[PDB]
Amino acid sequence: MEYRLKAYYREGEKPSALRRAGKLPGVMYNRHLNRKVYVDLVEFDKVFRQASIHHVIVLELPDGQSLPTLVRQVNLDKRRRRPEHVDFFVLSDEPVEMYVPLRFVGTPAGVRAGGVLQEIHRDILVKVSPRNIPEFIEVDVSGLEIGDSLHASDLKLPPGVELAVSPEETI
């Protein structure tokens, strides 16, 4: 649900140097702060592959401090398919725009016939307060031939939440 990941500070160390030694250069920020950091590459991957940009990672800083953050952006090295840098958004109590998973609670009538349900949205953008961050967002999918579909306007929307996309958006 909530993940921990050890993070450290950097100044002048070259990214290529860090990157060489198994560390992922990165940065943490929010309206109030902005700090150059790095986390260990393999430790991060273990976490990120569960977290994604969905759940809160919390950063155990050397100083003792413990920031609750969302991953905001992950740069890839195009040529090697690997992360070169991460952007850690430090959560406060203010609302925050974010991506929340969609779980399609159901089985298709269009599939099981002669079909393939391309689901165009794995998740959905959503204005929300950090103390109210979901895990799921449930989607009724009893009937969907090839090809009908829904547009997020028809989404359950828990208490605390607020669609951050035009409700004309296909899921």
């Binding site: 990120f48 890839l76 398919r81």
Partner: protein
């Protein structure tokens, strides 16, 4: 096989294969992909050779995405002529592909099937490739 419905220009300078892809470097549609390991002009006939192999392996089933398009006209002079007397004739179309580009994606199909089908597709392409699956990293993009 693919080519532009229309072009603003019939023929175009050869240009150059430097660099990793500008974009298209992450999975965006399916679950599995095939990424270019080397730069090359992939040709329309080559792409379709790959497409068809995939469809044959699925027995019509599943969905296939083709993420490169041949928009670059390939020129050739007639056999046995000398140099000069102007640029040759367009003999077909190619897509310029640089390493990191995801060329095809598959969806709605088992892991074994995406695997084999992407493997095979590779064998029709004149470059090294690697098969990939969707990650956190693609969704973050």
């Amino acid at each position: 096989m693919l080519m532009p419905r229309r072009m603003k220009y019939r023929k175009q300078q050869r240009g150059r294969l430097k660099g990793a892809t500008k974009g298209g470097d992450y999975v965006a549609f399916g679950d599995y992909g095939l990424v270019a390991l080397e730069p090359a002009w992939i040709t329309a006939q080559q792409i379709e050779a790959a497409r068809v192999a995939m469809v044959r392996h699925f027995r019509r089933g599943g969905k296939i995405f083709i993420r490169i398009f041949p928009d670059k006209p390939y020129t050739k002079k007639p056999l046995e002529v000398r140099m000069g007397k102007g640029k040759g004739n367009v003999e077909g179309y190619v897509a310029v592909v640089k390493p990191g580009r995801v060329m095809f994606e598959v969806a709605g199909v088992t892991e074994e099937q995406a695997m084999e089908a992407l493997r095979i597709a590779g064998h029709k392409l004149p470059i090294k490739t690697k098969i990939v699956r969707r990650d956190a990293y693609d969704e973050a993009q």
